[PDB]
Design a protein around this ligand. Structure first.
Ligand SMILES: CC(=O)N[C@@H]1[C@@H](O[C@@H]2O[C@H](CO)[C@H](O)[C@H](O)[C@H]2O[C@@H]2O[C@@H](C)[C@@H](O)[C@@H](O)[C@@H]2O)[C@H](O)[C@@H](CO)O[C@@H]1O
Length: 406
């Protein structure tokens, strides 16, 4: 059996997929895997798909620029892999679900919101705000827990010639908004946004999420941010953190390996912290950032791909992924963490800090509309002065209500 496997090359690198594929072929001598890894995995497989040649299994989460996963989800072109949760992990005698940590099978994995899983969870990386711990301590600053403190810090930093905030690409606001929305309104309000409850963007809580972000990207943003907020130059904005020209950026644990070969200010130490909330004593949420592994409905070897998918939750697979910081969402995989990951996961141990996860529902779609463009990509426009706060809200409410109608 020959499996065609396409995987996204992100901050964790592609060598881990080469080694994992090699390790599966050593365990399972009857399976050969043709692995394709690429930073542009959409452009690789989409021509073959529209020509009839589909890969058997794809590693690509929600949130890409092309939105390939969401598109195939809209065309009902992604195989139901709920039975993968019950499969025996190759090399072991445990089921996939026996090994999964809590709070990783949800709206992201069940984009139609039922009991059917279509995107199996990949990785397990906390997202929040990444900064230089040493730079903050050198200036006598403490990590803000509220946005009032965050903007007062922005003023203090601005007086020293340091921008408060930057971001790699606008897409990185999926984790940011997941935290900020849940911080302000709570869990039910969060699910309501993700599932397009009518007029949810007209609520005071959704307006406050937009006002806070509007103030951030229009008054406390590194001036070079939007010009570099693309797939080719996103690391430039990330470098401004290592250079000390920007304090904070929304990011996840892949940043450590992704910026492994980069210069940085003397004494640089990674800092990690939840996005601040708006109210004293409010819960702060860290985003469980996962990507997805999935099988197209047109795949020709679904059964062999499912068995290989189960192997991605094995101890062997987890130890290979872990070398670059990619922590598979299996139990105990945060025990015995590498030192460079401790600052990130230790944020879960802070008082009144919990987890948030999920993405937008795929149960409805409207031609010409894209809620992820209206919420995430619209930051670039808002930061550029092309979109007012009222225009931002009106667009989100219109798109969300339209999606509600379907
Ligand atoms: C620029 C890039 O590819 N970065 C990836 C990173 O993808 C981003 O992950 C964050 C998580 O908050 C957001 O989902 C963001 O939208 C992602 O960026 C998109 O992904 C790719 C496909 C690209 O088209 C971008 O233009 C999009 O903005 C990965 O999470 C990370 C780990 O694999 O590696 C890279 O850094």
């Amino acid at each position: 059996t020959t499996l065609k496997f396409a995987a996204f090359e992100g901050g964790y690198g592609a060598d881990m997929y080469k080694e994992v594929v090699a390790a599966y072929e050593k365990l399972n001598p009857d399976v050969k895997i043709e692995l394709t890894t690429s930073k542009k995995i959409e452009d690789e497989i989409t021509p073959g798909m529209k020509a009839g040649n589909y890969p058997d299994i794809v590693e690509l989460g929600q949130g890409s620029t092309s939105g390939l996963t969401e598109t195939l989800l809209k065309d009902k072109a992604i195989e139901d892999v709920t039975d993968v949760l019950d499969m025996k992990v190759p090399g072991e005698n445990k089921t996939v679900k026996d090994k999964l940590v809590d709070g990783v099978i949800g709206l992201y994995t069940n984009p139609y919101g039922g009991d059917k899983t279509y995107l199996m969870p990949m990785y397990y990386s906390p997202s929040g705000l990444v900064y230089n711990k040493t730079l903050l301590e050198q200036n006598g600053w403490k990590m803000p827990t509220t946005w009032d403190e965050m903007f007062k810090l922005g003023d203090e930093a601005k007086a020293k010639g340091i921008s408060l905030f930057t971001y790699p690409t606008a897409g990185y606001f999926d984790a940011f908004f997941n935290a900020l929305l849940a911080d302000i309104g709570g869990d039910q309000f969060y699910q309501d946004v993700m599932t397009y409850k009518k007029d949810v963007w007209k609520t005071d809580e959704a307006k406050e999420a937009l006002e806070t972000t509007y103030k951030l990207v229009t008054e406390y943003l590194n001036p070079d941010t939007v010009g570099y907020a693309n797939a080719q130059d996103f690391t430039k904005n990330q470098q401004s953190i290592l250079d000390g020209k920007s304090l904070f950026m929304p990011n996840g644990t892949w940043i450590v390996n992704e910026m492994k070969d980069a210069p940085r200010t003397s004494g640089f130490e990674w800092g990690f912290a939840p996005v601040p909330t708006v109210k004293n004593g409010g819960t702060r949420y860290i985003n469980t950032t996962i990507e997805a592994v999935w099988i197209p409905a047109k795949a020709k070897n679904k059964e062999a791909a499912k068995k290989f998918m189960a192997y991605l939750y094995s101890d062997e697979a987890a130890s290979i992924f872990a070398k670059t910081g990619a922590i598979q969402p299996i139990k105990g995989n945060t025990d015995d963490l590498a030192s460079d990951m401790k600052v990130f996961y230790d944020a879960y141990n802070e008082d009144n800090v919990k987890a948030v996860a999920g993405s937008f529902s795929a149960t409805a779609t409207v031609e010409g509309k894209n809620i992820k463009d209206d919420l995430y990509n619209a930051v670039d426009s808002v930061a550029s002065g092309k979109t007012t706060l009222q225009q931002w809200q009106d667009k989100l409410n219109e798109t969300s209500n339209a999606l509600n109608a379907a």
